[PDB]
Amino acid sequence: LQEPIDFLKKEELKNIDLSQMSKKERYKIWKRIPKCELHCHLDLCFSADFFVSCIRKYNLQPNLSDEEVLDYYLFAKGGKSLGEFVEKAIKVADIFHDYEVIEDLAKHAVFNKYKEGVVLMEFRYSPTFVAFKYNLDIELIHQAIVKGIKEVVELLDHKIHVALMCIGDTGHEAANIKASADFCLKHKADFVGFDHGGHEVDLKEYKEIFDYVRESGVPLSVHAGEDVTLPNLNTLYSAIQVLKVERIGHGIRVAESQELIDMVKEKNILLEVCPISNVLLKNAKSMDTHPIRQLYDAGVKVSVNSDDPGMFLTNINDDYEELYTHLNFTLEDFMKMNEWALEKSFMDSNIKDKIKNLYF
């Protein structure tokens, strides 16, 4: 009995010398890490090849080459801020033409995570973000995503487990947090959590909406402590103290306050760190100086996530490579962070226990 990837067992880790290896050989090791990913936006999760196929299926950029398409739409070379990312992402919504492309996107998103060695996958998406460009029905968007994920998961005999979060977001046409919350609870059978992304806002002004979702048994993980241009850390305090989140999207600015470090440790909150995203968006000065190292050393629970493989033309194993090369993270660290990720995942505990017994 065998599968394509020979996943790494924690007993085997000491026999692997990464110092011997070329980048190519390292990536074969990163692929074999049984990965649990908590923060990936399905609606911006795709390969370059998939993205360009969409643009050409609907004849959207006839005067542009394949490479010019990627430069025009995506964020692979990075930019100046989170604000610049959010506007760029709005252009990408050109591919949300119909429910068939959305299903295909979902299918290819799941399949590539499987190929990359992800065993536990919490995808998240924004109904309103997917719906606005072509005025789609969020009920049918959701139907397409659920169908695409289910079809690939069943084809793969559940060798990758996938769960879904709903994002209420700010920064695009037809954004609506309340409506997203209602939609999330309407489909709570399919959603394991609720999130806020886009522009980083102080979410205490939506206290009522988040209380209602949380109290309904849908746990919260929101984007907070990402955007370094904000003049204080109020969004982090509101996420932790008002929203009572179990996890924080990014949360890297927690590193700037000993009070917040102590608070997140005390409350067993996990920071869903997205290294490449932070660097490309200039929320970290460089990978050498990425806060994850200080946070890891400080005893804070952190995990590795890819965020937007489509926007950055990267995948999860790249984020692993960068942490190893620039910040000397080890296989033992990576295994530990993935077990934390498993523990803090919003997935059904029965499923999570099988994954734990199978890989950890």
Ligand SMILES: Nc1nc2c(ncn2[C@@H]2O[C@H](CO)[C@@H](O)[C@H]2O)c(=O)[nH]1
């Ligand atoms: N703040 C923030 N929002 C993001 C990021 N990646 C995707 N999103 C948002 O998530 C939604 C799509 O899932 C859109 O509102 C995107 O702008 C990110 O790295 N930071």
